[PDB]
């Protein structure tokens, strides 16, 4: 009965009935983290994650926590992503984006409160679970910080002044932007379910393909709707996400266990119009 | 054997280390954190972890990393409080502020970078070390947070617009991380459970004196503005004094915590 649509239901509903807590003070914060959280989103991240520990072990609501922890470090960089300084954004998904509602200095905070409280509960679920979440939590921590989703970030914000940017620095910066929490979700999914050295290899670059289609699916999305559209051509593009989905697809036919449901997300990821 | 002053120093030789590394296209992120973190600072937080595992082990430099995690979260805070949408400081201790330097975006970023560095090197740290670090960095990710640090912060810019709320702003703000360095010290040093105890209460006047004494700097809203000057400087006074009675109450090595609790009631800035 598993469902991927049912899956970001059940996905918004713990996300909601999180936030949804008894404050005295800080309710302003709880607020502005519940309204960026709450607002809407495919949850791709958390679903990976999920269906990641599903190919392996069907009782997935036992790691919804870690699940709902990835998108909190997502959803906090949107915030700080939409900020005056940075893209300057007023809306997302036609609603208003945090600080337009809350103001600046409440949503840099709010967008700090979630990537810390994404780290709170790891590290409970970790004291609770033992080692294979710590581990997983390094794969999360990682991905998200220095030398993933914020290094993407950086070099993004550098460049904005390039009129030229070289290949080289653009798979950098869109392998670090978003390929590496995209990876993230799968590989501590398929960590948390234990799964064999031979499964992890296989992961990781069904990881790292799901990513890259990601990436280029972003930019056809915005020219149809710096580039690798610029360099490539739309046809190119095009092609490129159908063949890497392909791809996608058929690692995950090596392996052995419930892969459909990934499959589904995989080529949904490939038609999505956002 | 011991000296605060060279302890300071081992803290800022230990993250300048840290922060001296290549980098082929984020190196901009990781100068922008390393200017936060080597423009100065008492280190009253790392330093306050290492003592406080020092009242029951020697091997301070065991937990360098952790202190140095600690040290990260609070010049995180530094550089975000600093913004324009905050308390838009162009210079701290007489140096230009990150965002000045960087710019703002980039300043963000760092800031963002930082409170994920503490935890980055805190769950390497205990994949290594394993349950007594973990439950360390339990209590250093939840001082520091919404329901510490960052509520503390949203706390004192709702209020820029009672004394149950001014008390919450005070102990969040900045008693929390102060307290969270007493314990995860002596967490990682394994601390019987009654010592723990003991320690929480310290940590708390600790952290409670250091807000006091802040606000009676600012002089040369505030603890200043409810009590009054003269108040202030006898509460400094009479809650440093039971900090003492509490470490004298405790077996092992307490002198050099309570040297520096000594230094934190007679210090300038």
């Not at 600046?104 to 790891?122: P, S, Y």
């Amino acid at each position: 009965a598993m469902n991927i649509n049912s899956l970001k239901e059940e996905v918004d509903q713990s996300l909601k009935a999180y936030f949804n807590k008894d404050r005295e003070y800080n309710k302003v914060l709880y607020d502005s983290m519940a309204y960026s959280i709450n607002v809407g989103g495919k949850r791709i991240r958390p679903i990976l994650m999920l269906l990641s520990y599903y190919i392996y072990k069907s009782d997935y609501k036992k790691i919804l926590t870690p699940a709902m922890a990835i998108e909190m470090i997502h959803t906090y960089s949107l915030i700080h992503d939409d900020l005056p300084c940075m893209d300057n954004d007023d809306l997302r998904r036609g609603k208003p984006t945090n600080h337009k509602v809350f103001g600046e200095a409440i949503a840099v905070l709010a967008g700090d409160a979630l990537l810390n409280e994404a780290m709170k509960i790891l590290v409970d679920y970790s004291l609770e679970e033992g080692k294979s979440a710590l581990k997983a939590t390094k794969i999360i921590a990682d991905a998200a910080g220095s030398d993933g989703m914020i290094g993407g970030q950086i070099v993004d914000i550098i460049n904005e002044d390039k009129e030229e940017i070289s290949l080289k620095e653009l798979d950098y910066m869109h392998l670090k932007k978003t390929g590496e929490l995209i990876k993230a979700s799968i590989m501590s999914g398929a960590v948390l379910a234990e799964a064999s050295e031979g499964d992890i290899k296989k992961l990781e670059g069904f990881g790292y393909k799901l990513g890259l289609a990601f990436q280029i699916k972003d930019d056809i999305l915005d020219v149809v709707g710096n580039n690798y559209i610029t360099i490539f051509g739309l046809e190119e593009c095009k092609k490129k996400c159908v063949n890497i989905t392909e791809e996608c697809i058929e690692i995950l036919s090596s392996i052995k266990g419930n892969t459909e449901p990934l499959k589904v997300l995989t080529m949904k990821l490939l038609e999505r119009k956002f």
